[PDB]
Amino acid sequence: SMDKVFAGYAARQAILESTETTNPFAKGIAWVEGELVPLAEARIPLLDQGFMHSDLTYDVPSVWDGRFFRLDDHLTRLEASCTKLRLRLPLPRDEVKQILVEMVAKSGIRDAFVELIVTRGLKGVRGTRPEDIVNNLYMFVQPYVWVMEPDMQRVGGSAVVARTVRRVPPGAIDPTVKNLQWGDLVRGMFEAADRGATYPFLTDGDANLTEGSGFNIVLVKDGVLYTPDRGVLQGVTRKSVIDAAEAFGIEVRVEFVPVELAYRCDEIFMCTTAGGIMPITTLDGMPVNGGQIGPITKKIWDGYWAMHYDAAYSFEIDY
Amino acid sequence: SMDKVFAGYAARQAILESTETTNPFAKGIAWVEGELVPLAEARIPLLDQGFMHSDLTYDVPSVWDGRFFRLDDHLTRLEASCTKLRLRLPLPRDEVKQILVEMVAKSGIRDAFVELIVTRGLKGVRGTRPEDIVNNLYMFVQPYVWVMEPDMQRVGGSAVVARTVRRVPPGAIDPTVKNLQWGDLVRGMFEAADRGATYPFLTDGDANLTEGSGFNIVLVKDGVLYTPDRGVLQGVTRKSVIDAAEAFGIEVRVEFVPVELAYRCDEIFMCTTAGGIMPITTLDGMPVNGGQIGPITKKIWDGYWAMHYDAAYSFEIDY
Ligand SMILES: Cc1ncc(COP(=O)(O)O)c(C=O)c1O
Ligand SMILES: Cc1ncc(COP(=O)(O)O)c(C=O)c1O
């Protein structure tokens, strides 16, 4: 049912575009210091510690066909991330939700990438008394972003297990805290391109799989799903994959996933908010179990997008 | 001869402060997109990938008593860092040097912290063709920053070996590439404060010392200097420490430094551009070999500041 999903998106894109010459927010909208402004014009202070030392957390809910998807899960993860970094969401949570909906309405964007950022503020942890630290908030709405483009999801992507880089371990930086410190992940993207592939899979350096440059990894083997427990973000897409699998009666094991399972499994897909369910059909230059998108991947694919119209996981925005 | 160095600084500081209310650049000046602006007013595009994914490198030379210290070393390290990250300094190096000198002069600042930042730009590595990527440059000059303030340097600070966090390993993020991804270092600063100390010493997760939140670590035992080789920034202050130690006939060992050596060494000091030579007299709540600043620390301290008037390591700015 990719045709239905992608055709609906192509149609809504054409409409969105024809608003660009008259709606200054049609290419994205940003919230900065309580003002709304076109995304291409948003500026932040050079001295903000979110920039000076990437001292921040963030989270990215999405809108599809005018329905916010699992927004409360994203806001709850954001607050959990903040707590773990000794940050505090600078506005009441219900007010933040209110602003996000309004921002989407003004943009007219029906399929949107939505980002919230909480930074330490203008005074850094080093030599500022904690009582004088004032956290900052930034939010923006932009057109939906594809870690895997629709036309590649019909074909499958190519991945490698990275050998020149490995994932930052939790004892250095907690990967359950969503953060913008992408040094290892960018190295991985460089390595995949050098090796003639699109996506990097990073190990934990101890012969287990973790995650990639903006996605969780799922292996399928003998009808069972396998996905890394430790060392990764606990994605909302992954959580939706788990909800779908259980509804379908497919076993899911969130556990230590040895690198070797990647070379003898039946299917592979990545999952993430900016793109959804993303099949992988070659691994280290070899077809994954024959090279075709697998049946369980397809079932999860359809179940994920179905959830976007399910009131238990979504709500409709008034534009 | 701390008295002379610090009293000279205090005097120049009183002059600078007296002008804060009439020189608009006296609190700092920034270069953004070819424009010079007061530092407190400088702003960068929200969508710059230096913010969105901390996809950048940086470097921090300094000015002392109107004399740039080792600027060409810092600029060469910046270019080497750019190369490792596949970035390119956006202006010719000699034009970059000329702008900085101009910026210091306009500010009137005689003791300056000078930062250069090269970011990926407005288009990210994920989903932009490399040929369409355009790196951005930001620079600023601000009053000299003290990781350890003069009064504390006369007496020594207190550190802990961090036990809730360890340093990001090189196979994840190269610590010789100066970067603003301080997730582990901020955790270290929190841990130190939680424990009633100031400075965190992070290990490599294999029982060896690395560096801290903005500084290298040097141990002194039986007349020999020891400082970690792998897993740390190759500090320009550390390079100056080595030049001074060789000048004095003191042996320096840049090698693997087991954590245990910190508990039985004779002296400890930190070194960094933002403060210079910073003695440590208590470790994990215990005195370091008596709790007094050691004689080899004092010799390195004096020689470090003497090098700031040596034409081989510095040049005078025309204000
Ligand atoms: C490193 C990383 N892992 C996993 C994910 C997937 O998380 P989620 O499904 O909540 O978007 C992302 C999100 O972009 C990510 O950046
Ligand atoms: C992590 C880290 N280690 C060491 C240093 C010391 O480098 P340098 O002496 O060149 O300033 C710095 C400087 O702030 C640093 O951030």
mmCIF file of C-alpha atoms in Angstrom, chain A residues 27-219:
data_model
loop_
_atom_site.group_PDB
_atom_site.id
_atom_site.type_symbol
_atom_site.label_atom_id
_atom_site.label_comp_id
_atom_site.label_asym_id
_atom_site.label_seq_id
_atom_site.Cartn_x
_atom_site.Cartn_y
_atom_site.Cartn_z
ATOM 1 C CA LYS A 27 8.550 26.431 3.736
ATOM 2 C CA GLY A 28 8.638 26.137 7.539
ATOM 3 C CA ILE A 29 8.028 28.165 10.681
ATOM 4 C CA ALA A 30 10.172 28.724 13.776
ATOM 5 C CA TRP A 31 9.521 29.797 17.378
ATOM 6 C CA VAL A 32 12.329 31.953 18.793
ATOM 7 C CA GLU A 33 12.030 33.910 22.052
ATOM 8 C CA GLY A 34 8.238 33.903 21.741
ATOM 9 C CA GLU A 35 8.074 35.162 18.127
ATOM 10 C CA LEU A 36 7.047 33.200 15.047
ATOM 11 C CA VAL A 37 9.201 33.641 11.930
ATOM 12 C CA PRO A 38 9.848 31.882 8.602
ATOM 13 C CA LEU A 39 12.245 29.012 9.153
ATOM 14 C CA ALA A 40 14.809 30.322 6.654
ATOM 15 C CA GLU A 41 15.032 33.548 8.695
ATOM 16 C CA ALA A 42 15.268 32.097 12.220
ATOM 17 C CA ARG A 43 18.414 33.032 14.139
ATOM 18 C CA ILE A 44 19.681 31.980 17.576
ATOM 19 C CA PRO A 45 22.284 33.738 19.754
ATOM 20 C CA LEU A 46 25.856 32.717 18.982
ATOM 21 C CA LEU A 47 26.468 32.443 22.744
ATOM 22 C CA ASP A 48 23.676 29.910 23.317
ATOM 23 C CA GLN A 49 25.246 26.837 24.917
ATOM 24 C CA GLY A 50 23.155 24.594 22.680
ATOM 25 C CA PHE A 51 25.616 25.835 20.056
ATOM 26 C CA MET A 52 28.734 26.554 22.149
ATOM 27 C CA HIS A 53 28.855 23.024 23.643
ATOM 28 C CA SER A 54 25.869 21.227 22.063
ATOM 29 C CA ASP A 55 24.507 21.288 25.619
ATOM 30 C CA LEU A 56 20.891 20.460 24.799
ATOM 31 C CA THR A 57 18.327 17.788 24.116
ATOM 32 C CA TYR A 58 15.641 17.709 21.431
ATOM 33 C CA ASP A 59 12.764 15.639 20.103
ATOM 34 C CA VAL A 60 11.027 15.311 16.746
ATOM 35 C CA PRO A 61 7.330 14.431 16.469
ATOM 36 C CA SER A 62 5.684 14.489 13.046
ATOM 37 C CA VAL A 63 2.438 15.350 11.244
ATOM 38 C CA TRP A 64 1.001 13.173 8.481
ATOM 39 C CA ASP A 65 -2.054 14.026 6.373
ATOM 40 C CA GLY A 66 -2.861 16.707 8.921
ATOM 41 C CA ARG A 67 -2.725 14.311 11.908
ATOM 42 C CA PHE A 68 -0.130 14.671 14.665
ATOM 43 C CA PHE A 69 1.400 11.235 15.298
ATOM 44 C CA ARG A 70 2.075 10.116 18.901
ATOM 45 C CA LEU A 71 2.810 13.679 20.016
ATOM 46 C CA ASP A 72 2.400 12.871 23.711
ATOM 47 C CA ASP A 73 5.013 10.106 23.529
ATOM 48 C CA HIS A 74 7.470 12.595 22.041
ATOM 49 C CA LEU A 75 6.724 15.262 24.668
ATOM 50 C CA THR A 76 7.120 12.672 27.424
ATOM 51 C CA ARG A 77 10.480 11.579 26.009
ATOM 52 C CA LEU A 78 11.577 15.211 25.763
ATOM 53 C CA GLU A 79 10.769 15.789 29.441
ATOM 54 C CA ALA A 80 12.600 12.584 30.357
ATOM 55 C CA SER A 81 15.633 13.689 28.332
ATOM 56 C CA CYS A 82 15.538 17.094 30.043
ATOM 57 C CA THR A 83 15.462 15.520 33.503
ATOM 58 C CA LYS A 84 18.487 13.349 32.667
ATOM 59 C CA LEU A 85 20.508 16.431 31.602
ATOM 60 C CA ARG A 86 19.332 18.659 34.504
ATOM 61 C CA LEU A 87 17.380 20.766 32.013
ATOM 62 C CA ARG A 88 13.764 21.930 32.343
ATOM 63 C CA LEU A 89 11.258 22.515 29.545
ATOM 64 C CA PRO A 90 10.941 26.334 29.716
ATOM 65 C CA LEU A 91 7.146 26.367 29.205
ATOM 66 C CA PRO A 92 4.279 24.330 30.639
ATOM 67 C CA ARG A 93 3.864 21.193 28.558
ATOM 68 C CA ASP A 94 0.259 21.902 27.579
ATOM 69 C CA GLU A 95 1.269 25.362 26.351
ATOM 70 C CA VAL A 96 4.050 23.839 24.228
ATOM 71 C CA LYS A 97 1.516 21.511 22.581
ATOM 72 C CA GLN A 98 -0.785 24.489 21.933
ATOM 73 C CA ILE A 99 2.018 26.418 20.202
ATOM 74 C CA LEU A 100 3.049 23.433 18.078
ATOM 75 C CA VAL A 101 -0.485 22.926 16.757
ATOM 76 C CA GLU A 102 -0.810 26.625 15.975
ATOM 77 C CA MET A 103 2.572 26.582 14.220
ATOM 78 C CA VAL A 104 1.445 23.684 12.028
ATOM 79 C CA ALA A 105 -1.848 25.467 11.266
ATOM 80 C CA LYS A 106 -0.102 28.672 10.141
ATOM 81 C CA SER A 107 2.356 26.747 7.977
ATOM 82 C CA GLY A 108 -0.408 24.890 6.135
ATOM 83 C CA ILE A 109 1.989 21.908 6.021
ATOM 84 C CA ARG A 110 0.058 18.630 6.210
ATOM 85 C CA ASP A 111 3.105 16.320 6.282
ATOM 86 C CA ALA A 112 5.599 17.897 8.659
ATOM 87 C CA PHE A 113 8.840 17.369 10.537
ATOM 88 C CA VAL A 114 8.432 19.041 13.955
ATOM 89 C CA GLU A 115 11.437 19.780 16.176
ATOM 90 C CA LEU A 116 11.694 21.002 19.776
ATOM 91 C CA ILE A 117 15.065 21.965 21.295
ATOM 92 C CA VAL A 118 15.879 22.749 24.948
ATOM 93 C CA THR A 119 19.351 24.224 25.550
ATOM 94 C CA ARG A 120 21.290 25.086 28.700
ATOM 95 C CA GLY A 121 20.871 28.759 27.788
ATOM 96 C CA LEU A 122 23.281 31.666 27.518
ATOM 97 C CA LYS A 123 25.368 30.628 30.563
ATOM 98 C CA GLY A 124 27.396 27.416 30.499
ATOM 99 C CA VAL A 125 27.706 24.732 33.174
ATOM 100 C CA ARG A 126 31.424 25.535 33.500
ATOM 101 C CA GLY A 127 31.649 28.475 35.879
ATOM 102 C CA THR A 128 28.014 29.525 36.097
ATOM 103 C CA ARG A 129 26.298 28.934 39.410
ATOM 104 C CA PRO A 130 23.420 26.483 38.737
ATOM 105 C CA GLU A 131 20.882 28.968 40.142
ATOM 106 C CA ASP A 132 21.835 31.472 37.418
ATOM 107 C CA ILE A 133 21.388 29.036 34.503
ATOM 108 C CA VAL A 134 18.272 29.785 32.420
ATOM 109 C CA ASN A 135 17.352 27.143 29.814
ATOM 110 C CA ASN A 136 16.261 28.188 26.304
ATOM 111 C CA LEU A 137 13.581 26.714 24.016
ATOM 112 C CA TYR A 138 13.500 26.573 20.207
ATOM 113 C CA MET A 139 10.867 24.885 18.034
ATOM 114 C CA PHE A 140 10.201 24.658 14.324
ATOM 115 C CA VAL A 141 7.963 23.007 11.742
ATOM 116 C CA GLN A 142 9.292 22.087 8.300
ATOM 117 C CA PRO A 143 8.175 19.905 5.367
ATOM 118 C CA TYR A 144 8.394 16.184 6.115
ATOM 119 C CA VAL A 145 11.979 14.833 5.890
ATOM 120 C CA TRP A 146 12.882 11.419 4.396
ATOM 121 C CA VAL A 147 15.860 9.486 5.735
ATOM 122 C CA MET A 148 14.845 7.146 2.884
ATOM 123 C CA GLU A 149 13.002 8.776 -0.035
ATOM 124 C CA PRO A 150 9.655 7.227 -1.062
ATOM 125 C CA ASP A 151 11.050 5.859 -4.333
ATOM 126 C CA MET A 152 13.950 4.183 -2.505
ATOM 127 C CA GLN A 153 11.529 2.575 -0.023
ATOM 128 C CA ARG A 154 9.980 0.808 -3.027
ATOM 129 C CA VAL A 155 13.393 -0.613 -3.952
ATOM 130 C CA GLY A 156 15.275 -0.976 -0.664
ATOM 131 C CA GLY A 157 18.476 0.680 0.534
ATOM 132 C CA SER A 158 22.077 -0.489 0.869
ATOM 133 C CA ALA A 159 23.849 -0.571 4.246
ATOM 134 C CA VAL A 160 27.254 -1.503 5.652
ATOM 135 C CA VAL A 161 28.336 -2.503 9.129
ATOM 136 C CA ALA A 162 30.769 0.290 9.914
ATOM 137 C CA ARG A 163 34.385 -0.682 10.543
ATOM 138 C CA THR A 164 36.076 2.735 10.888
ATOM 139 C CA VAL A 165 33.741 4.044 13.630
ATOM 140 C CA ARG A 166 31.559 2.697 16.450
ATOM 141 C CA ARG A 167 28.713 4.155 18.485
ATOM 142 C CA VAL A 168 29.379 6.449 21.458
ATOM 143 C CA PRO A 169 28.923 4.128 24.502
ATOM 144 C CA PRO A 170 26.271 4.969 27.146
ATOM 145 C CA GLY A 171 28.979 5.570 29.790
ATOM 146 C CA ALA A 172 30.210 8.555 27.755
ATOM 147 C CA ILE A 173 26.896 9.899 26.373
ATOM 148 C CA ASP A 174 23.533 8.309 27.203
ATOM 149 C CA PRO A 175 21.925 7.336 23.855
ATOM 150 C CA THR A 176 18.449 7.261 25.442
ATOM 151 C CA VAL A 177 18.844 11.050 25.808
ATOM 152 C CA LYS A 178 18.138 12.440 22.350
ATOM 153 C CA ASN A 179 21.081 14.660 21.478
ATOM 154 C CA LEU A 180 22.646 16.438 18.516
ATOM 155 C CA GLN A 181 26.209 15.228 19.112
ATOM 156 C CA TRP A 182 26.421 13.340 15.823
ATOM 157 C CA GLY A 183 30.211 12.951 15.502
ATOM 158 C CA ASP A 184 30.205 9.163 15.260
ATOM 159 C CA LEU A 185 27.085 9.170 13.083
ATOM 160 C CA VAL A 186 28.535 11.597 10.525
ATOM 161 C CA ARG A 187 31.714 9.492 10.375
ATOM 162 C CA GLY A 188 29.425 6.562 9.616
ATOM 163 C CA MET A 189 27.695 8.397 6.789
ATOM 164 C CA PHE A 190 31.111 9.226 5.315
ATOM 165 C CA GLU A 191 32.181 5.585 5.565
ATOM 166 C CA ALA A 192 29.027 4.260 3.885
ATOM 167 C CA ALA A 193 29.544 6.643 0.948
ATOM 168 C CA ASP A 194 33.237 5.699 0.673
ATOM 169 C CA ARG A 195 32.154 2.048 0.515
ATOM 170 C CA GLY A 196 29.463 2.606 -2.128
ATOM 171 C CA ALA A 197 26.412 2.262 0.159
ATOM 172 C CA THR A 198 23.834 4.625 1.624
ATOM 173 C CA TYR A 199 23.336 3.731 5.288
ATOM 174 C CA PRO A 200 25.743 2.949 8.159
ATOM 175 C CA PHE A 201 25.049 0.387 10.909
ATOM 176 C CA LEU A 202 27.245 1.149 13.953
ATOM 177 C CA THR A 203 28.338 -1.545 16.397
ATOM 178 C CA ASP A 204 28.942 -0.985 20.116
ATOM 179 C CA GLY A 205 32.572 -1.968 19.591
ATOM 180 C CA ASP A 206 31.932 -5.270 21.421
ATOM 181 C CA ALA A 207 30.482 -7.219 18.451
ATOM 182 C CA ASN A 208 26.842 -6.091 18.915
ATOM 183 C CA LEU A 209 24.672 -3.893 16.683
ATOM 184 C CA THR A 210 23.289 -0.567 17.925
ATOM 185 C CA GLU A 211 21.659 2.011 15.590
ATOM 186 C CA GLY A 212 22.443 4.242 12.623
ATOM 187 C CA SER A 213 22.608 7.864 11.448
ATOM 188 C CA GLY A 214 19.109 8.785 12.540
ATOM 189 C CA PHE A 215 17.300 5.416 12.761
ATOM 190 C CA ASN A 216 16.934 2.227 14.804
ATOM 191 C CA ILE A 217 17.755 -1.147 13.209
ATOM 192 C CA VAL A 218 15.461 -4.200 13.068
ATOM 193 C CA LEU A 219 16.459 -7.680 11.908
#
